[PDB]
Design a protein around this ligand. Structure first.
Ligand code: NA
Ligand code: NA
Ligand code: NA
Lengths: 296, 296
């Protein structure tokens, strides 16, 4: 009947008003892909993957090109993707030297009997699937070099509901700035970086991964919904619990199986967008929600 | 209040009756350690860690020495440990050439600001913490070589509640036989391989990791308990859902914050034990269960 996609570009401090425009374009671009896949009758899984591939490639976002740097100034990436129909799933942690982690995560889903590969095994699998190796400097940006140095001297996602009622999520990240080598956050961990179940809804998360893991943020959001809460309530309760119980900030996007959706966050901002019923909703701060009529 | 420990040695097919005896001793040994830590007023965390170190070292159990082999006939190990008071946690995935993964997981919890390290980063952190490297052939047993060849031609854990009312879990594994290089199962993933929260209880799981991850078995068990189910009901519902929804078999051990506990499984057997009120309970098949009066 009425497909939806929601996308997020990761929490942040306040954002430079020039930088906000480039971020807006990034988000819109990703929603346009996601929504276009759904409008032709494609699947929720291809919709979330396509949106996330766009944000990975866009260097304003901490995923793929533009990933934050680890303690050695290198890019190490996590991702996962999940289909709500049968709960099948794919994820990779600590991958290096590839453009699109979410696409390697989909290959784990489709081409192996496992849901999760890491580091060397993931690199081997990538090679065996013909994924091209790109040099790591390609993913490093100047903004992120300076962000590393500042921090020493002292994530993207999408969910969707498709024409057949299937839901799905995808989440991809470079991590947190100055993380230890081989540190793994919530983003590749089912129930933490996201969760997708046709009997409830789908969620993708962002923020302090350690906190997100300790509270199982994605799955916890969906529990509240199983208990009769609205998506707005579910998101406020889960993010509030993470704040009070473990002093962790972040955000998330959710879509229930009936088409209700929301974006919430406890950081200052989280770039988000949603496309539904021929309308594109967009925001960054809790002030500035725009609705744009699309054709349709 | 009065302390409990429960331990499990992983699901299995039916077990050779000679082998059952060695397994029995293994389990009793691990409960004895766990329970001896609690009885001197030690913590739930040190209790679950000590039980699991014993089962890692024992070659009858798929964790540490006696880990199942991956597709290249090598040992690759996952583990995690979690404290229910403040939800803090440590985990490692795809580690090689160390005797005790659960101790490396505890060091991630105590000595880093992260909850999860993998592969090369985990090996580096281990080296920097002085963990000795042991050669991989030390963890490989003859039974596991033959188990690998059979599959080609064709987990341990503990929970506890301590004198102060804190709970915890620990889970450690060598994986599933013939897994791809760098495959990661549920055991190092919070909410899947286990979960611990003083407001609810603690759970450690075993079985088909992919399924466990897709359902968030550990956290799911606890949800059912938050909804007013008994521990026995919670476990039956959560394992039944894994069976029906994704065709996955396994088991788990659970302890609520009020001291109720149980062991359940959907595989043929699961070696388990529990110590409480001066009694030691033990079993392998669902049919029979021994209770031994301890001196306490
Ligand atoms: Na990017
Ligand atoms: Na062992
Ligand atoms: Na497990």
């Amino acid at each position: 009947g009425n497909p939806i996609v929601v996308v997020h570009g990761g929490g942040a401090g306040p954002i430079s008003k020039d930088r906000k425009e480039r971020v807006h374009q990034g988000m819109v671009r990703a929603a346009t892909v996601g929504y276009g896949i759904l409008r032709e009758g494609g699947s929720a899984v291809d919709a979330v993957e396509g949106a996330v591939v766009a944000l990975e490639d866009d260097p304003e976002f901490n995923a793929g090109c533009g990933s934050v740097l680890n303690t050695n100034g290198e890019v190490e990436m996590d991702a996962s993707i999940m289909d709500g129909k049968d709960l099948s799933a794919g994820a990779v942690s600590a991958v290096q030297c590839i453009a699109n982690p979410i696409k390697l995560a989909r290959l784990v889903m489709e081409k192996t009997p496992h849901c999760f590969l890491t580091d060397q095994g993931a690199a081997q699998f990538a090679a065996a699937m013909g994924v091209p190796e790109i040099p790591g400097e390609k993913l490093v940006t100047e903004r992120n070099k300076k962000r590393l140095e500042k921090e020493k001297h002292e994530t993207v996602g999408a969910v969707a509901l498709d024409c057949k009622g299937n839901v799905a999520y995808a989440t991809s990240t470079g991590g947190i700035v100055n993380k230890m080598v081989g540190r793994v956050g919530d983003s590749p961990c089912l129930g933490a970086g996201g969760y997708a179940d046709n009997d409830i809804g789908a969620v993708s998360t962002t923020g302090h991964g350690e906190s997100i893991l300790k509270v199982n943020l994605a799955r916890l959001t969906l529990f509240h919904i199983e208990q009769g809460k609205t998506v707005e309530e579910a998101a406020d309760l889960s993010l509030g619990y993470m704040k009070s119980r473990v002093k962790g900030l972040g955000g998330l996007i959710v879509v229930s199986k009936t088409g209700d959706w929301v974006a919430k966050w406890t950081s200052t901002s989280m770039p988000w967008a949603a496309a539904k019923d021929g309308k594109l909703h967009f925001g960054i701060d809790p002030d500035d929600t725009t609705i744009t009529d699309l054709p349709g």
